Design a protein around this nucleic acid. Structure first.
Lengths: 37, 139, 274, 141, 184
RNA sequence: CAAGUCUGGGCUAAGUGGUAAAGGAUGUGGCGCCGCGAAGACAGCCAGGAGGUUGGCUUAGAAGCAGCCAUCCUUUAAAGA
């Protein structure tokens, strides 16, 4: 679930980061590793 | 020369064969896999059925030990109402029932296991298991 | 490949069977294709070199087919008429039957439901060999339409026109259509298999088996290991060897037996329509 | 789909969407509703696509009330054809929806479910919407 | 209940909304004064109170009349009560809407369906003295099928319905079940 | 490029400004209602965190933790079927 236009919380362990003006969302499962775009 | 144990099996009544999980855990016990079907079913030759929990503990020389508890609370309540199965959907469907004394008779059967030392408290632990399996209390 | 190689192969095993009696060659007793009995991937594999080189034979390597079966769900009753009355040897045959699906593994049952005898005695045998017959190519793929009970409960005749043959067709018609009408169902083969595996590997072993169109049936230990039993579709059961020895690094073994036939998941109904 | 049964006119003029709603701007039936914020033309399909997933989400749920009813013939000339030659033929239908209009509302369900099915419905819809409850909808005769 | 209200001179009834307060007007067969009340406290009260229970309004003139919201107009595009109608109750019996209390689980309640509150507010009448409340309606013996209506209800020591009777008060209807298709 | 790098208060931190949509976001300021508060609260440490009981039904097996329901009791300082 990397690049995309709608990044959301795929499980509470997920966290909404925003480093460098880019909204990222990280969790324990590399699957959830998102990032907007 | 296998090692030690606080084995917490869960073996029923009667069916005493070395077959697992009485094998892999009790092969490092040296367990008299036949001194149970006799020491057990002698005291449970009374009941006949219902599982009997058991904690077989081994030691150094290759000896064992094992303390058994009572049959599931859910059991004695299944017969004191002509049941076998609960009621599938507790609450709505009453399939049978137990009076205020029949409750106070079973709680005798398991009073030295729970924690309370009464019956007004014991009985309740029975009476709670009544809606756990869909069987009201005759009151 | 082309029927040419089909021969080089015949010699291929006629000498390769003696030069290695750890295998067996079998021609599917119903449908040409020949199986290569091995004992491990490699086994059959290296033969595919010798058998393809030192024999120059060059053929195809897919997997077996499955002995499917036709039947229906709903029971039906249709007419069996035949009649061709134009001017002489009339050909007059007609009957009505009662078709009814039976437990997968019921077989073949007919019914002489004819009262007094509206359908003359001499012809019944013929109306069965007709019905019996038809049941060969299914209404769906062309397979042994079975597990059914048939009820001849009516039908007439003509004194002069009728024919032993005329009836065989009429009956072969009522059959050839009751199946079409009572909603067909593609039955298939289920196997019994028992994998001996150290409950070490077991964990996935069961998995794997579940993800194989199969449903578990038990596991009563054996040796130091543990057995698992269950049913499975031969289709999603092929080359299970190199899959059991995968989940088990070697410590695994299984058997397999046929048992019954049974309906396909519909999604697999229209799959087979080719 | 859904649509008129009869009709005096097979074809009808466009017109243009203004504010307001004229009516149907309140509950009156269910417990929870969905309402339009932006005006538009919703096709039968759009409606159905939602109504569906509406019920789909809540297997065994209550009753949904379609408070909207297309009746406006959707025109469109044939493709690769110039102007003139009369009007166009019907393609489908649509119900002219304006802001403040209660599109559907459900009745008899947990808040959890209702507040969610509608969240989805709104995705099927081409316009943004609000999800209302029932407070001051009392008396709207 | 209470509610702080004030007199309006009658100047820019829209200046008031912007202003922050909600333009009103109360009356009755005798007197009608144009008024206005703050939202917050009218939300927070009408939010509950509504049109079932009176609201005693207090004006800077000591009076503290008892009234019912006989009407609440809206802002349609965004619903925002834009003007109320306080009926100054009296002593004379007048009609109002009393709430219905469906007191008894029907059969649809284990079977299924959903109770349909086809008319949770009815129009009766009674002197403001007797300010009834939940008019209990009897249910139980009802299962997804027909229903009951008319005036089959406990009419209090002075309440005296002003509807028909006959109006289908409420009925239970069949739930939706995902897997269901009829087309074919 | 002719006339305020004018004055007071406020927002914006992308060069947004310097042109676009649904839909995403602990952006960032601002108004609000409504809770816990020193017989010790938020983050916080070490602690305990249990027994009836693997609840009942179902299943291959369901033991707090597929999924139906159901949610009583208990010994307590406290522990959810």
């Amino acid at each position: 679930m990397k690049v995309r236009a709608s990044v959301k919380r795929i499980c509470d362990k997920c966290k909404v980061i925003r480093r460098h003006g880019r909204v990222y969302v990280i969790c324990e499962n590399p699957k959830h590793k998102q990032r907007q775009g | 020369k296998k090692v030690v144990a606080v084995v917490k099996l869960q073996l029923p009544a009667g069916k005493a064969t070395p077959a697992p999980p009485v094998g892999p855990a009790l092969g490092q016990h040296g367990a008299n896999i036949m001194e149970f079907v006799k020491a057990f079913n002698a005291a449970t030759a009374n009941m006949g059925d219902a599982i009997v929990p058991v904690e077989i503990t081994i030691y150094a020389d290759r000896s064992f030990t094992f303390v058994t508890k009572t049959p599931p609370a859910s059991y004695l309540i299944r017969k004191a109402a002509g049941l076998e199965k609960g009621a599938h959907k507790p609450g709505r469907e009453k399939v049978g029932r137990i009076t205020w004394e029949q409750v106070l008779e079973i709680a005798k059967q398991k009073m030295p296991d729970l924690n309370t030392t009464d019956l007004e408290a014991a009985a309740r632990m029975i009476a709670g298991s009544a809606r756990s399996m869909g069987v009201e209390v005759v009151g | 490949k082309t029927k040419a190689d089909q021969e080089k192969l015949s010699q291929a095993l006629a000498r390769l069977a003696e030069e290695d009696p750890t295998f067996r060659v079998s021609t599917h007793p119903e449908t040409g294709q020949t199986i290569i009995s091995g004992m491990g991937e490699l086994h059959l594999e290296i033969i595919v070199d010798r058998l393809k080189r030192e024999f120059k034979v060059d053929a195809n390597v897919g997997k077996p087919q499955v002995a499917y079966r036709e039947t229906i769900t709903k029971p039906v009753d249709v007419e069996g008429k035949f009649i061709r009355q134009t001017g002489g040897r009339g050909q007059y045959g007609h009957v009505k039957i009662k078709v009814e699906p039976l437990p997968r593994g019921s077989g073949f049952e007919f019914v002489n439901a004819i009262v007094g005898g509206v359908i003359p005695k001499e012809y019944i045998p013929a109306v069965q060999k007709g019905i019996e017959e038809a049941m060969q190519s299914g209404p769906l793929i062309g397979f042994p339409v079975v597990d059914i009970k048939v009820t001849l409960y009516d039908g007439s005749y003509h004194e002069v026109d009728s024919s032993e043959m005329a009836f065989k067709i009429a009956g072969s018609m009522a059959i050839k259509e009751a199946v079409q009408k009572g909603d067909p169902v593609i039955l298939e083969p289920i196997m019994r298999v028992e994998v001996t595996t150290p409950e070490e590997y077991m964990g996935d072993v069961i998995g794997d088996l579940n993800a194989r169109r199969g449903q578990i049936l038990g596991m009563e230990p054996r040796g130091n290991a543990q057995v698992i039993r269950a049913f499975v579709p031969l289709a999603e059961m092929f080359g299970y060897a190199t899959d059991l020895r995968s989940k088990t690094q070697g410590r695994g073994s299984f058997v397999m037996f046929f048992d019954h036939y049974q309906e396909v998941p519909k999604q697999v109904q229209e799959k087979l329509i080719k | 789909m859904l649509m008129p049964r009869r009709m005096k006119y097979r074809k009808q003029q466009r017109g243009r969407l203004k504010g307001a709603t004229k009516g149907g701007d309140y509950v009156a039936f269910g417990d929870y509703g969905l309402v339009a914020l932006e005006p538009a033309w919703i096709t039968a399909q759009q409606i159905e696509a939602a109504r569906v997933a509406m019920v789909r989400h809540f297997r065994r749920g209550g009753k949904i009330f379609i408070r909207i009813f297309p009746d406006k013939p959707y025109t469109k000339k044939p493709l690769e054809v110039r102007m003139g030659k009369g009007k166009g033929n019907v393609e489908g239908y649509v119900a002219v929806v304006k802001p403040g209009r209660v599109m559907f509302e459900v009745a008899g369900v947990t808040e959890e479910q209702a507040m969610e099915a509608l969240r989805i419905a709104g995705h099927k819809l081409p316009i943004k919407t609000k999800i209302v409850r029932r407070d001051a909808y009392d008396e709207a005769q | 209940y209470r509610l702080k209200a004030y007199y309006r001179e009658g100047e820019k009834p829209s200046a008031l909304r912007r202003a922050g307060k909600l333009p009103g007007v109360m009356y009755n067969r005798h007197l009608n004064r144009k008024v206005y009340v703050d939202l917050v406290e009218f939300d927070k009260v009408f939010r509950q109170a509504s049109i079932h229970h009176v609201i005693v309004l207090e004006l800077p003139d000591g009076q503290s009349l008892p009234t019912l919201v006989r009407q609440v107009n809206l802002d349609k595009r965004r619903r925002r009560p834009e003007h109320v109608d306080f009926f100054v109750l009296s002593d004379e019996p007048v009609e109002m809407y009393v709430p219905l209390r469906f007191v008894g689980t029907p059969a649809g309640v284990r079977a299924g369906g959903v109770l349909q509150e086809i008319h949770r507010d009815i129009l009766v009448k009674v002197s403001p003295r007797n300010i009834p409340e939940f008019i209990e309606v009897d249910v139980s013996g009802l299962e997804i099928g027909d229903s009951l209506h008319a005036s089959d209800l406990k009419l209090p020591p002075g309440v005296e319905l002003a509807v028909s009777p006959e109006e289908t008060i409420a009925a239970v209807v069949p739930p939706e079940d995902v897997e269901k298709l009829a087309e074919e």
